[PDB]
Amino acid sequence: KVFGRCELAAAMKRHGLDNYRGYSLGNWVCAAKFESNFNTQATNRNTDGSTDYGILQINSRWWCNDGRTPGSRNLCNIPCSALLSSDITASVNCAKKIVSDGNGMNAWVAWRNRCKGTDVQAWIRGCRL
Ligand SMILES: [Cl-]
Ligand SMILES: [Cl-]
Ligand SMILES: [Cl-]
Ligand SMILES: [Cl-]
Ligand SMILES: [Cl-]
Ligand SMILES: [Cl-]
Ligand SMILES: [Cl-]
Ligand code: NA
């Protein structure tokens, strides 16, 4: 599924991400925009053989099981395929664990490089939330 900007903001709010760990909804929408362009089915291989999955590009090195990332963990206790669903529940639940892990949203390098410190409220501007 390719979400619209306000459609995703609304789904993230429905699943309790808005202001989760103090990160406003615009932070989460911005992260999704630059990680996946709002596409739930986005997958990207990393140099080290791990793969990033879904709207928030969650990495098989730590968070999900894809069966092909040697020495990796599965801390969200999910198959990485669950992160590609049209329903964002699994991606949101897992993202809540990642952002709780100690470095907040810096875990998303695209968030640090493209969203952190910017006018992230623009991402939810005009949305009926
Ligand atoms: Cl957009
Ligand atoms: Cl915001
Ligand atoms: Cl594996
Ligand atoms: Cl594990
Ligand atoms: Cl699995
Ligand atoms: Cl959803
Ligand atoms: Cl933080
Ligand atoms: Na894994």
Which sequence spans correspond to the domains of the chain? 5-124
> Distance between CA atoms of 30 and 52, rounded to whole angstroms?
17
- Check 18, 35, 87, 119 and give the catalytic one: 35
**Ligand 2 geometric centre to CA of 29 (Å):** 8
* Length, in residues, of the chain: 129
Closest CA to 91 of 64, 129, 112: 64
From residue 23, give the alpha-carbon distance in Å to each of 47, 50, 60, 68: 29, 27, 23, 32
The end-to-end CA distance of the chain, in Å, is: 20
In the CATH scheme, what is the code of domain 5-124? 1.10.530.10
From residue 102, give the alpha-carbon distance in Å to each of 39, 95, 96, 98, 105: 27, 13, 12, 8, 9
From residue 30, give the alpha-carbon distance in Å to each of 12, 41, 50, 118: 12, 17, 23, 10
- Check 7, 18, 48, 52 and give the catalytic one: 52
Q: Which residues are annotated as a binding site for substrate?
A: 101
Coil vs helix vs strand at 65: strand
From residue 126, give the alpha-carbon distance in Å to each of 7, 21, 22, 26, 105: 12, 24, 21, 12, 24
Closest CA to 86 of 36, 39, 124: 39
**Ligand 2 geometric centre to CA of 42 (Å):** 24
